[PDB]
Design a protein around this ligand. Structure first.
Ligand SMILES: [Cl-]
Ligand SMILES: [Cl-]
Ligand SMILES: [Mg+2]
Ligand SMILES: [Mg+2]
Ligand SMILES: [Mg+2]
Lengths: 231, 195, 204, 111, 243, 225, 250, 241, 244
C-alpha cells in the first residue's frame, strides 16, 4: 500500500510487497512441471503462444551437459539467471575440473536473487525456475523463487494452475521416485502431471516442451515432433 | 648479530648495537630490540628504515587487536610481520626475529627471513654476523636452560659474532621475557670481549 | 642531451644602494647553431622582475605561468605582489614538479614597495631559494659569472655605477661561453623608475 | 629475471585429404635435455568435428585449447546449438590469439 | 507520521520502525534455538514440511562458519544466508591476518557491526532475521543471538521464531535445574525436546528436526551435524516427553 | 656539517652555512636550521629543496595538529610525520635531518635519514662533514653537560667540518632549546671566514660600457584620464 | 550504501526564498549574542560563555578561536558547526595560501575561503547549510585591521562594529551610538563589555565571558627569539583576571 | 513534513532527527555517573540483566577504547558498539601517525566532529548515543569528556547521564558546592569508587548488589573495569560505615 | 530511498518553463538594482547596495561591482556568495585564454563561458541554479565597448543600456526614453544615476548606498582604464549631476 514503492521497504507486518509482486508474475506465467527418480530428472513445460501466427515461447534452458532449468514468469530474467548459472557451472569446470553440484547451484541463485531484494534502485527477479541435474550424488530437482528461497524436491510445479500438477505428484510420490532406468516412463508421469493443470487447451506438438538429464544422459531438450511420442 | 632463545622461564632476545653505512658506523649504540607489545618483542636486521616501518605498523595492528580481542599470541604477532614481509618482498630488505611470552604457551620464537617465510624454533639467529656462530650455537644450545645459562649462551654467542663480523659491534643488548615481567640487560665491550 | 645547456644563456642580478639590477644575454640556439638574438630572458610582473635561464620552452612556459598567477593574485589581493612573496611563489611552483621539474634557473629581482628594501634571489630547477645580499648568477656561464661578480662587486653601489659593474660581469662571462652572448640587456631598477639598456657586444 | 615462457618441444602435423583430415603429434614433453612425460596428449577433440593442437609452450597451448573448447560451448548456447564450421573456428582462434598480441601465446596452432 | 516509511529515520519516540517491522518477519519464521553446554554449544531448528514432495534431510538450514562456528536463524532465509556469507568473509580475513581462528565474541561483533550498518541508511533494508550462533574457541564455549537492530548478547540459552515464548520457558527451566551445567549429549536431547514442545505454535503442518553441535570433548571443538543414531536417539527422547 | 647535542636541561643543534653545486659554492651564508614549531627545530643536509619542503610541510601539519589538540607539539610527532613521509618516497626526497626540541614530555634529540630510518642519541652529526664533527664529539662529549659546554661542543664539531670538509664552510648557526624557556636561534653564532679586503677597487668609470638603446620601462598600471 | 543524495537540499521556493538558508539564519537568531568592534589600533571580539551545566568546565569549550596568528573568530548559532568550520578555516589558510606564498593570508581572503565553504553547503548535494554566523577579526600588513561577518548563505560584509545572535538588534543600536573612528583598543573593549552586559541574564564576570583582541604584536607569545622580522601573534585571548580588572572600571 | 525525516532545518531552525536521537539515548533505561579523584577518574553505570538466559558477563556498556582511555555509553548497544569500534580505530591510528597516545579530550572532539557530520549530511543518520570518555591524561590529569548526537562536547568536573541524570547531577552539584574543589580529594581510587556508588545510591534512592552495578576506573597509564567481586568489596566497605 | 527528498531542480513545467530558473529570477527581482550604459567613448556601471547600515565599512566593501580582468568588469544582482563562485571561475577562464593565445580574452567569449556554466545547472546535476544575474561591461579590439547580461537560465544578450535586479521594468522604460546613440560617458553617468534615483525604493539616493564604475578609453592614448569609484568619488559625482 504505502510500503510497496520499492524493494527496500518492509511493511508493518514484516512483508516485502515488491518481492510478493514479483512472485505474482510467476503465477501469471505458463505452467511447468519438474520431477525425478533416482536415475533421471525430468522437466515438462507448457509453452505459451501470443496468437496463431506466433511461435510458442521457449520455456527450457540448458546450463551445462549435466544441468538445466525451466522458467515461468519474465523470460528475460530467466535468461539473466540461466546465463549466470552457465558461467558458474563453467567456472567450476575450468578452475576445479569439477561439475557444479546442483545444491551449490541453488545456493548461488539464492544469493544472487537476495541482493536484488535488499538494495535500493534495483528490483527482484520476476521469474521462477525449476532446476534439474545429475551430479555426484545422483538426480536432483530444485525450485527457485525470486524471493531467494531455493528448495530441493522430489517433484513440483510452478506457474498458472500449477496446484493441480503439484497435488498429482504428491499422490504419485511413491510411484515415480521408483522409475529407475526408464526415461520414457518418467516423462509419461511428468506429461500426466502437467495435464492436471490444463483447462480448455490440450497438449499439441508445438505446445509441449520436455527436457531430461540422468546417469548416462546429457541434458537434452525435446520439442516439435520429438514429443509427439508422448502426446 | 641478533638472536632469540627460549628457556625454562620464558624467552630472551639479544642483539648488538652497530648500524653501518658501508664501513662507517652511523650509530654505535643502536637498539635493535623493539617492542610491538608488552611481552612480544622483535629483533631487527637488514634495512633500518624497512624494519622500523614494519615494526611500527605491527605495533599499530597489535594495539588495535588488543582493543578489540584482548592480548594477542606471539604466533599472531609473527603472522602480522609475515603478512607485511611476504606481500612486500620485492620492496623490502628485512630479517626479523619475533619473540614473546604467553602464560599458556610460555616462551616462543619465530624467525622471518628475507622471503617472508615463518619458522617456529627453540632459538633463532640472524644478521650478517650470525653466519660465524652457526657452529657454536648448535653445539652449545640446550632446551630448558636457566635464565643465567641462557644469558651466558647469548652473551658468548654474540661476542663471537661481534668478534668476526665488521657489521656487528658495540654493546650487547638483551631483553628477558618471563611471567615476572620485562627485564632489560646490557653488556659492554670490556665484559664480553675477554670471554 | 643535457636540457639546461641545449639553448644556452645567462642571467645575473645585483643589489646596489636603494636599487637592484638584473641582466641577461639574448642568445637562443640549438646547441652549436645560433637561432635567435632577440630571446630576452627577463620578464616582469608589476615591479617584480624575473630572469629565467635554461631550457627555452620552460622559460616561456614559466613566464606565462607566473603572469597567470600574479594576475590572479592582484585581482584577489587588490595589490601588486612583492619580491619576497613572489620568491616563495616561484619556489612553491617549482617544487610541485619535484620529480618532473622545469629545467630552469630562475632569478628574482625587485624592490619592496613598502619597505624600499632591495631584494634578489636565485633558485635551482626544483625550488631551493638562494637569497643572497650581494649577487645571484644563473646559466651556462654561471662559473664565469661567479668569478666576475665575486671580484668586481662591492656593496652600496649607485645605480649608474652598478650598471657598469653588472654589464662588465655579464659581458666578459658571456665571452668565455660558447652558448651565451649574441646581445645583452640590463635592467636598472629603482623604487619608482626602471631603465632598460641594450648592450653592444661581440656577435660570435 | 623471470622468463614467463618455456619450450616443451614436440612436433605436430596436419594433412587435408579429399573427404578427410588428419592431425598428428608426438606424445613427448620435454624441458631442456630432460623428458617430462613420454605420453602427454597434445592433439585434442574440441567438438563439432574439429581437432586442435597448440604446439610450443605447453602452458600457453593448454590455455588456448581450453579457451577454444570454451568458445565452442558458448557458440552453442548463444546460437541455438549451431555447428561451428571449421572456417568460423579458424577466425575465432585468430581473435583469441591476437587478443594477446602484446603478450602472445607462444604456440604454433593447427586445426 | 511517515517515520516508518524509510529506514534509519528516528520517530519522535527515538525508534527505528523499519527495524521493528523486520522483527515481525523474524517472529513470522520457524522456531530455532541454541543451548550452551559444559564444553560447547548445541543448535537446533524447526523445518516445516510444507509438502510431501520435500526431500527429507536435504534442505539444510543450519550453516557452518569457518570450522568451529555454527549459525542458525529464523525469518527471511535468504537474508540469513547473506549474513553467513559475510560472516565467512570476516572469519577468513581474520584468520588470514592473525593466523588463529576467529574467536566467537570477535565473530559476534563482525556480524553485529554489519547488521547495525543496515540500520544507518535509507538505501538499504534491515535484516529480516534473528541469528543464533556460537562455538568453541581458546576461552571455551560461547552462545550468541543477534537481532535485526544489530543488538546481540551472550546467552546460556537462546530462542527465536514463532515458538520463542514456549522455547524460552523451557530454556529457563534447564538453567534453574542445572546450575553446575549441562553435558553436550544432554543438550542435544534437550534441544530436540524444546523444538518438539515449541512446535505447538506451528502445529498445522508437521516438521523435520535438525540439530548441530560444537563440543570440546565430543567433536574436538569443530562444528558437526547430529546424524543417524544420535539424531534418532534425540528424536525418541523428544517424542517420549511430549506424550 | 650539522650536529645535535643534548645537555642538562635541554638540547642544542648547529650547522655550517655552505651550499654547493658540484665544486662551486652557490651560497656562502645558507640557513640550514629550520623551525618546525616554536620549540622544535631541525637541521637539514642533502638536497636543499627537499630539506626545506619536507620541513615546511610537517611544520604546517604540526601547527594544525597543535591547534586541533589544544596542546604544544611534540618532537616525536614531528619525527613520526617526517619518517613516514620520507619512507613513502623511498629515499628520493633527499632529506637528512637532525630533529631536536623541547615539549611537555621533556627534551629530545633524533636523527632522520632519507629512507625514513630514525635514531636516538645524546650527540649526533650528519652530512659530508659528519665524520670530522663526530670525531670531535667522540673526543670531547660527556654526560651531564651544561648549556655553555654543549654550545661549545656543538660549534667545535661544526668547525671541524668547516675546516676539514670541502662540502662545509663559512659560518656556524646555532639553536638552543632549553626546558621551560624560549628557544634561542643564534644565526651566525660564529663568523671565522670573513673575506679579507681586496687589493684593488674594480669600480668602473661611467660610460665604460657600450650601449645601443635606452628606454623607460612602464611598471605602473594603466593610468587615469 | 554510497551517498545517494547527489541533489540539492536547498532550493528556491516560488517566492524566490532559499528556505534552508532562512531557517539557518533563524537558528543563528536563537544563538547566544556575540559582537565585534573595530578600533584604530585593534579589533575586539566577544561573547557569553553560556555554560550548559555548572559541572561542565567552560574553559574547555572555546567559543573564540585563533585561525591564524593575526586572525580570530567568534560565532552565534550551532557550536558544533562552528567547531568544524574553524578546523577547515585553519587548514585552508595553510593549503590554499601559506604553502603557496610562505605567509599567512590577509583577513579578507581567509574570510573569502570560509565564505566559499559555507556557500558550497548551500548548493552541493545532500547537505544542509551551516547553522552559524561568524565574526572574523584580523590584521594584515597592507589592509590593516578589519572585521568581517559571514552568514549561512556564504555572504560576507566588512563592519566597523556589529553584533549577531540573540540580542543583536538592540546591541547594534547600542554600538551605533558609541562607535566613532577615533576609538583606541581599550575604549572598544570597554564598549564591548557594556554592550554584552545588556544581553546577559545571570553572572557577568571573566569566567562567564569570552573575549579576545587583534592588537599589537606579542613577542612574549612567539615562543622563540633570533628572527627580527618575526615579532609574534597579534591575536590574544584575554584572561579571566584581565576581564575582571576592566569590569571594575565599568 | 520531510524536514523531520532527514537532517535539514525546520522553519524554527531545529533538527528534529538530532532531537529524536537524544530520545533514543534513554531507551536502555540505564544511568551512568563519572567523577574525578586526585590520581584517577571513576565511571559507574547501572547494570540490568532482565533475562535469566543472558550471559551477564557479556552485558556491558563500558568499553576499553585504548590502554589509557575508557568509554561508557548511554544508548542502544548497536550504536554503542559502532561508536566504540570507531573510537578504538581512531585512537590506534592517532598513535601510529603522531607517535603518542591519543588524549581523552582529542578523541572526544574527533568523535564529536563525526557526529556533527551526521547532523549536516543527509544520507548518514545520527547515532542515538551519548559517549562519556574518561582517562588520566598525561598533560591534563583526570579527565571526563562527553559527546552527544548533536556533535556537542565539553569537559566535566563530574557528570551524569540517563533518565534520572538530573537527580544525580544536582546531588553532585551540591557536594561540589560544599567541598569547593573540582574533584574528589582522595588518594586511593577504591575510595573514589565508593564515593561514586554512595552518591548514586543517595540520588536514585536505590540499594545496589554486586550485579546491579558496572564500574570502570582510569589511572595513570591504564584504564580497567572492576569485576563483580571487586565491586562487592566496595559495597561492603560502604555498608560498614 | 533518497528519491523521496529530491526536489528535481532541472525539470520543465507543463508550460515548458524551468521552475528553478523562474524562481531564481524572482529572487533576483528583490536584489539591489544594477544599471549598465554603453557610450561611444566608454561604459558606465552603476549599482545600488541593499538597505545598508551606518556601521558598515563601505570603503573596503564590495557586493555589486567586481573586476574580472583589466578590460572586463561585472555588476551583480542576486546572491553575492553565488556570484563570487562564478566570478572566480570567470577570472580563471580569462587567464587560461591569455596563457593559451597570449591575447586578452574577447568579452563575448568570457560571457558565453559563464553563461554555459549557468546553463549546465539547469539541465543536469540535480543542483539548484546560481541565483545571480550579471551585467558585463568590457572592451576588446574587435567589437570595442560591449554590454552584456546573463541570468540563471544561462541565456545572455547584448545591450546599449540595461538594468538588472529590482524595478527593471521602470528602469528600462526610463533608459529607453533618454538614451541616444551618440551619447558620451559623462552623459551616461548622469543617466545611470538619474534612473537609480527614480527607481530606488529608498527615500533618497546617497553615496553610501551606491557602487559605481566606468570603463574608459580615457586612459593615456590607445588603451583602456577601469575605474572603481571610491565612496568620496561617488559623493562628488552625485553633487556634480545635481542629485544631492
Ligand atoms: Cl634501528
Ligand atoms: Cl575531525
Ligand atoms: Mg666488530
Ligand atoms: Mg660567446
Ligand atoms: Mg542525516
Amino acid at each position: 500500500n504505502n510500503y510497496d514503492g520499492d524493494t527496500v521497504t518492509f511493511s508493518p507486518t514484516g512483508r516485502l510487497f515488491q518481492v510478493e509482486y514479483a512472485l505474482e508474475a510467476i503465477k501469471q506465467g505458463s505452467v511447468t512441471v519438474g520431477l525425478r527418480s533416482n536415475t533421471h530428472a525430468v522437466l515438462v513445460a507448457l509453452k505459451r503462444n501470443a496468437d496463431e501466427l506466433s511461435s510458442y515461447q521457449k520455456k527450457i534452458i540448458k546450463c551445462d551437459e549435466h544441468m538445466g532449468l525451466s522458467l515461468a514468469g519474465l523470460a528475460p530474467d530467466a535468461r539473466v539467471l540461466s546465463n549466470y548459472l552457465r558461467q558458474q557451472c563453467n567456472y567450476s569446470s575450468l578452475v576445479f575440473n569439477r561439475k557444479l553440484a546442483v545444491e551449490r547451484a541453488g545456493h548461488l541463485l539464492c544469493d544472487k536473487a537476495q541482493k536484488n531484494t535488499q538494495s535500493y534502485g534495483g528490483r527482484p527477479y520476476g521469474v521462477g525456475l525449476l532446476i534439474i541435474g545429475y551430479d555426484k550424488s545422483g538426480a536432483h530437482l530444485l525450485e527457485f523463487q525470486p524471493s531467494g528461497n531455493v528448495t530441493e524436491l522430489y517433484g513440483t510445479a510452478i506457474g498458472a494452475r500449477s496446484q493441480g500438477a503439484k497435488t498429482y505428484l504428491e499422490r504419485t510420490l511413491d510411484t515415480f521416485i521408483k522409475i529407475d532406468g526408464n526415461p520414457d516412463e518418467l516423462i509419461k508421469a511428468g506429461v500426466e502431471a502437467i495435464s492436471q493443470s490444463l483447462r480448455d487447451e490440450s497438449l499439441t506438438v508445438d505446445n509441449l516442451s520436455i527436457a531430461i538429464v540422468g546417469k548416462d544422459t546429457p541434458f537434452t531438450i525435446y520439442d516439435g515432433e520429438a514429443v509427439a511420442k508422448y502426446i | 648479530s641478533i638472536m632469540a632463545v627460549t628457556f625454562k622461564d620464558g624467552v630472551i632476545l639479544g642483539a648488538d648495537s652497530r648500524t653501518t653505512t658501508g664501513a662507517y658506523i652511523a650509530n654505535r649504540v643502536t637498539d635493535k630490540l623493539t617492542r610491538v607489545h608488552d611481552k612480544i618483542w622483535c629483533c631487527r636486521s637488514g634495512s633500518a628504515a624497512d624494519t622500523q616501518a614494519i615494526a611500527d605498523i605491527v605495533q599499530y595492528h597489535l594495539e588495535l587487536y588488543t582493543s578489540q580481542y584482548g592480548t594477542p599470541s606471539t604466533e599472531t604477532a609473527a603472522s602480522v610481520f609475515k603478512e607485511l614481509c611476504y606481500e612486500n618482498k620485492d620492496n623490502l630488505t628485512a630479517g626479523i626475529i619475533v619473540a614473546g611470552y604467553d602464560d599458556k604457551n610460555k616462551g616462543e620464537v619465530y624467525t622471518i627471513p628475507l622471503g617472508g617465510s615463518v619458522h617456529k624454533l627453540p632459538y633463532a639467529i640472524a644478521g650478517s654476523g650470525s653466519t660465524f656462530i652457526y657452529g657454536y650455537c648448535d653445539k652449545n644450545f640446550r632446551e630448558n636452560m636457566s635464565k643465567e645459562e641462557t644469558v651466558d649462551f647469548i652473551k658468548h654467542s654474540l661476542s663471537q659474532a661481534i668478534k668476526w663480523d665488521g657489521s656487528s659491534g658495540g654493546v650487547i643488548r638483551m631483553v628477558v621475557l618471563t611471567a615476572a615481567g620485562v627485564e632489560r640487560l646490557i653488556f659492554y665491550p670490556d665484559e664480553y670481549e675477554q670471554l | 642531451s643535457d636540457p639546461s645547456s641545449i639553448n644556452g644563456g645567462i642571467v645575473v642580478a645585483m643589489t646596489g644602494k636603494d636599487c637592484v639590477a638584473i641582466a641577461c644575454d639574448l642568445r637562443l640556439g640549438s646547441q652549436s647553431l645560433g637561432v635567435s638574438n632577440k630571446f630576452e630572458k627577463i620578464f616582469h610582473y608589476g615591479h617584480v622582475f624575473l630572469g629565467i635561464t635554461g631550457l627555452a620552452t620552460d622559460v616561456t612556459t614559466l613566464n606565462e605561468m607566473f603572469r597567470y598567477k600574479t594576475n590572479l593574485y592582484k585581482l584577489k589581493e587588490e595589490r601588486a605582489i612583492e619580491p619576497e612573496t613572489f620568491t616563495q611563489l616561484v619556489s612553491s611552483s617549482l617544487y610541485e614538479r619535484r620529480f618532473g621539474p622545469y629545467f630552469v634557473g630562475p632569478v628574482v629581482a625587485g624592490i619592496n614597495s613598502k619597505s624600499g628594501k632591495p631584494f634578489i634571489a636565485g633558485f635551482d630547477l626544483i625550488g631551493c631559494i638562494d637569497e643572497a645580499k650581494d649577487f645571484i648568477v644563473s646559466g651556462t656561464a654561471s662559473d664565469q659569472l661567479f668569478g666576475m661578480c665575486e671580484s668586481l662587486y662591492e656593496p652600496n653601489l649607485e645605480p649608474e655605477d652598478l650598471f657598469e659593474t653588472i654589464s662588465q660581469a655579464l659581458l666578459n662571462a658571456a665571452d668565455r661561453d660558447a652558448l651565451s652572448g649574441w646581445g645583452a640587456v640590463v635592467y636598472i631598477i629603482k623604487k619608482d623608475e626602471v631603465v632598460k639598456r641594450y648592450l653592444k657586444m661581440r656577435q660570435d | 629475471q623471470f622468463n614467463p615462457y618455456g619450450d616443451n618441444g614436440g612436433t605436430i602435423l596436419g594433412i587435408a585429404g579429399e573427404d578427410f583430415a588428419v592431425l598428428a603429434g608426438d606424445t613427448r614433453n620435454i624441458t631442456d635435455y630432460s623428458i617430462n612425460s613420454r605420453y602427454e596428449p597434445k592433439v585434442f577433440d574440441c567438438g563439432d568435428n574439429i581437432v586442435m593442437s597448440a604446439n610450443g609452450f605447453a602452458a600457453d597451448g593448454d590455455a588456448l585449447v581450453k579457451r577454444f573448447k570454451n568458445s565452442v560451448k558458448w557458440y552453442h548456447f548463444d546460437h541455438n546449438d549451431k555447428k561451428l564450421s571449421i572456417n568460423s573456428a579458424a577466425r575465432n582462434i585468430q581473435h583469441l590469439l591476437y587478443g594477446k598480441r602484446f603478450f602472445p601465446y607462444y604456440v604454433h596452432t593447427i586445426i | 507520521t511517515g517515520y516508518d516509511l524509510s529506514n534509519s529515520v528516528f520517530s519522535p519516540d527515538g525508534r527505528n520502525f523499519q527495524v521493528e517491522y523486520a522483527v515481525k518477519a523474524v517472529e513470522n519464521g520457524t522456531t530455532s534455538i541454541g543451548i550452551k553446554c559444559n564444553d560447547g554449544v548445541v543448535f537446533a531448528v524447526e523445518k516445516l514440511i510444507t509438502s510431501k514432495l520435500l526431500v527429507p534431510q536435504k534442505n539444510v538450514k543450519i550453516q557452518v562458519v569457518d570450522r568451529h562456528i555454527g549459525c542458525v536463524y529464523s525469518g527471511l532465509i535468504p537474508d540469513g544466508r547473506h549474513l553467513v556469507n559475510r560472516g565467512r568473509e570476516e572469519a577468513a580475513s581474520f584468520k588470514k591476518l592473525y593466523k588463529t581462528p576467529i574467536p566467537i565474541p570477535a565473530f559476534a561483533d563482525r556480524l553485529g557491526q554489519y547488521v547495525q550498518a543496515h540500520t544507518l541508511y535509507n538505501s538499504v533494508r534491515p535484516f529480516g532475521v534473528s541469528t543464533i550462533f556460537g562455538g568453541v574457541d581458546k576461552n571455551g564455549a560461547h552462545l550468541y543471538m543477534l537481532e535485526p537492530s544489530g543488538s546481540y548478547w551472550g546467552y546460556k540459552g537462546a530462542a527465536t521464531g514463532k515458538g520463542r515464548q514456549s522455547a524460552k520457558a523451557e530454556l529457563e527451566k534447564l538453567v534453574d535445574h542445572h546450575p553446575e551445567g549441562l553435558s553436550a549429549r544432554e543438550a542435544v536431547k534437550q534441544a530436540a525436546k524444546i523444538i518438539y514442545l515449541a512446535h505447538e505454535d506451528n502445529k498445522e503442518k508437521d516438521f523435520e528436526l535438525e540439530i548441530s553441535w560444537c563440543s570440546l570433548s565430543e567433536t574436538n571443538g569443530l562444528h558437526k551435524f547430529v546424524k543417524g543414531d544420535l539424531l534418532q536417539e534425540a528424536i525418541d527422547f523428544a517424542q517420549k516427553e511430549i506424550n | 656539517t650539522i650536529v645535535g647535542v643534548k645537555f642538562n636541561n635541554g638540547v642544542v643543534i648547529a650547522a655550517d652555512t655552505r651550499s654547493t653545486q658540484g665544486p662551486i659554492v652557490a651560497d656562502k651564508n645558507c640557513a640550514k636550521l629550520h623551525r618546525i614549531s616554536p620549540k622544535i627545530w631541525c637541521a637539514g643536509a642533502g638536497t636543499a629543496a627537499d630539506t626545506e619542503a619536507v620541513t615546511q610541510l610537517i611544520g604546517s601539519n604540526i601547527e594544525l595538529h597543535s591547534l586541533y589538540t589544544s596542546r604544544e607539539p611534540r618532537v616525536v610527532s614531528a619525527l613520526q610525520m617526517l619518517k613516514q613521509h620520507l619512507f613513502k618516497y623511498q629515499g628520493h626526497i633527499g632529506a637528512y635531518l637532525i630533529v631536536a626540541g623541547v615539549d611537555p614530555t621533556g627534551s629530545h634529540l633524533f636523527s632522520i635519514h632519507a629512507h625514513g630510518s630514525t635514531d636516538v642519541g645524546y650527540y649526533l652529526s650528519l652530512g659530508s662533514g659528519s665524520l670530522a664533527a663526530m670525531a670531535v664529539l667522540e673526543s670531547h662529549w660527556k654526560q651531564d653537560l651544561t648549556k655553555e659546554e654543549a654550545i661549545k661542543l656543538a660549534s667545535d664539531a661544526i668547525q671541524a667540518g668547516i675546516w676539514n670538509d670541502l662540502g662545509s664552510g663559512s659560518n656556524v648557526d646555532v639553536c638552543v632549546m632549553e626546558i621551560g624557556k624560549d628557544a634561542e636561534y643564534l644565526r651566525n653564532y660564529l663568523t671565522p671566514n670573513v673575506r679579507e679586503e681586496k687589493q684593488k677597487s674594480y669600480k668602473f668609470p661611467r660610460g665604460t660600457t657600450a650601449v645601443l638603446k635606452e628606454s623607460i620601462v612602464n611598471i605602473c598600471d594603466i593610468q587615469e584620464e | 550504501m554510497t551517498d545517494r543524495y547527489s541533489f540539492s537540499l536547498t532550493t528556491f521556493s516560488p517566492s524566490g526564498k532559499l528556505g534552508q538558508i532562512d531557517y539557518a539564519l533563524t537558528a543563528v537568531k536563537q544563538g547566544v549574542t556575540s559582537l565585534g568592534i573595530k578600533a584604530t589600533n585593534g579589533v575586539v571580539i566577544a561573547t557569553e560563555k553560556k555554560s550548559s551545566s555548572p559541572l561542565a568546565m567552560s574553559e574547555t569549550l572555546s567559543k573564540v578561536s585563533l585561525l591564524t596568528p593575526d586572525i580570530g573568530a567568534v560565532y552565534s548559532g550551532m557550536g558544533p558547526d562552528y567547531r568544524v568550520l574553524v578546523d577547515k578555516s585553519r587548514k585552508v589558510a595553510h593549503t590554499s595560501y601559506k604553502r603557496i606564498y610562505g605567509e599567512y593570508p590577509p583577513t579578507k581572503l581567509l574570510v573569502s575561503e570560509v565564505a566559499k565553504i559555507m556557500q558550497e553547503a548551500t548548493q552541493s548535494g545532500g547537505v544542509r547549510p551551516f547553522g552559524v554566523s561568524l565574526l572574523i577579526a584580523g590584521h594584515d600588513e597592507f589592509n590593516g585591521f578589519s572585521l568581517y561577518q559571514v552568514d549561512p548563505s556564504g555572504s560576507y560584509f566588512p563592519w566597523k562594529a556589529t553584533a549577531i545572535g540573540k540580542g543583536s538588534v538592540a546591541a547594534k543600536t547600542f554600538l551605533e551610538k558609541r562607535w566613532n573612528d577615533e576609538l583606541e583598543l581599550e575604549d572598544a573593549i570597554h564598549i564591548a563589555l557594556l554592550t554584552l552586559k545588556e544581553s546577559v541574564e545571570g553572572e557577568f564576570n571573566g569566567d562567564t565571558i569570552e573575549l579576545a583582541i587583534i592588537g599589537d604584536e606579542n613577542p612574549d607569545l612567539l615562543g622563540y627569539t633570533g628572527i627580527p622580522t618575526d615579532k609574534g601573534p597579534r591575536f590574544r585571548k584575554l584572561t579571566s583576571q584581565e576581564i575582571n580588572d576592566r569590569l571594575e572600571a565599568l | 513534513g520531510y524536514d523531520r525525516h532527514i537532517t535539514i532545518f525546520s522553519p524554527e531552525g531545529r533538527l528534529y532527527q538530532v532531537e529524536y536521537a537524544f530520545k533514543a539515548t534513554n531507551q536502555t533505561n540505564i544511568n551512568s555517573l563519572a567523577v574525578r579523584g586526585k590520581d584517577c577518574t571513576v565511571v559507574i553505570s547501572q547494570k540490568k540483566v532482565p533475562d535469566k538466559l543472558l550471559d551477564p558477563t557479556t552485558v556491558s556498556y563500558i568499553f576499553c577504547i585504548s590502554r589509557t582511555i575508557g568509554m561508557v555509553v548511554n544508548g542502544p548497544i548497536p550504536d554503542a558498539r559502532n561508536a566504540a569500534l570507531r573510537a578504538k580505530a581512531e585512537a590506534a591510528e592517532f598513535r601510529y601517525k603522531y607517535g603518542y597516545d591519543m588524549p581523552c579530550d582529542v578523541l572526544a572532539k574527533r568523535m564529536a566532529n563525526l557526529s556533527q557530520i551526521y547532523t549536516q549530511r543527509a544520507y548518514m543518520r545520527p547515532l542515538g548515543v551519548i559517549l562519556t570518555f574518561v582517562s588520566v591524561d598525561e598533560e591534563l590529569g583526570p579527565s571526563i569528556y562527553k559527546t552527544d548526537p548533536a556533535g556537542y562536547y565539553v569537559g566535566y568536573k563530574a557528570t551524569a547521564t540517563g533518565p534520572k541524570q538530573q537527580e544525580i547531577t544536582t546531588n553532585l552539584e551540591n557536594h561540589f558546592k560544599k567541598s569547593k574543589i573540582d574533584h574528589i580529594n582522595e588518594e586511593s581510587w577504591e575510595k573514589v569508587v565508593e564515593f561514586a556508588i554512595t552518591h548514586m545510591i543517595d540520588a536514585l534512592g536505590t540499594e545496589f548488589s554486586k550485579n546491579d552495578l558496572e564500574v570502570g576506573v582510569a589511572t595513570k597509564d591504564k584504564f580497567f573495569t572492576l569485576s563483580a567481586e571487586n565491586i562487592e568489596e566496595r559495597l561492603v566497605a560502604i555498608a560498614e560505615q | 530511498g533518497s528519491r523521496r527528498y529530491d526536489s528535481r531542480t532541472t525539470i520543465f513545467s507543463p508550460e515548458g518553463r524551468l521552475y528553478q530558473v523562474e524562481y531564481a529570477l524572482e529572487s533576483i527581482s528583490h536584489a539591489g538594482t544594477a544599471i549598465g550604459i554603453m557610450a561611444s567613448d566608454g561604459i558606465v556601471l552603476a549599482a545600488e547596495r541593499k538597505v545598508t547600515s551606518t556601521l558598515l565599512e563601505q570603503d573596503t566593501s564590495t557586493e555589486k561591482l567586481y573586476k574580472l580582468n583589466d578590460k572586463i568588469a561585472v555588476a551583480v544582482a542576486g546572491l553575492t556568495a553565488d556570484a563570487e563562485i562564478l566570478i572566480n571561475t570567470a577570472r580563471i577562464h580569462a587567464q587560461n585564454y591569455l596563457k593559451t593565445y597570449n591575447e586578452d580574452i574577447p568579452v563575448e567569449i568570457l560571457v558565453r563561458r559563464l553563461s554555459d556554466i549557468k546553463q549546465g545547472y539547469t539541465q543536469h546535476g540535480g543542483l539548484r541554479p546560481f541565483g545571480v544575474s550579471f551585467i558585463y561591461a568590457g572592451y576588446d579590439d574587435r567589437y570595442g565597448y560591449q554590454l552584456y547580461t546573463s541570468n540563471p537560465s544561462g541565456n545572455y544578450t547584448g545591450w546599449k543600456a540595461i538594468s538588472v535586479g529590482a524595478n527593471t521594468s521602470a528602469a528600462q522604460t526610463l533608459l529607453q526614453m533618454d538614451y541616444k546613440d551618440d551619447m558620451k560617458v559623462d552623459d551616461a553617468i548622469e543617466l545611470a544615476l538619474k534612473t537609480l534615483s527614480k527607481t530606488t525604493d529608498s527615500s533618497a539616493l546617497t553615496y553610501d548606498r551606491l557602487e559605481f564604475a566606468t570603463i574608459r578609453k580615457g586612459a593615456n592614448d590607445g588603451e583602456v582604464y577601469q575605474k572603481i569609484f571610491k565612496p568620496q568619488e561617488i559623493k562628488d559625482i552625485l553633487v556634480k549631476t545635481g542629485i544631492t
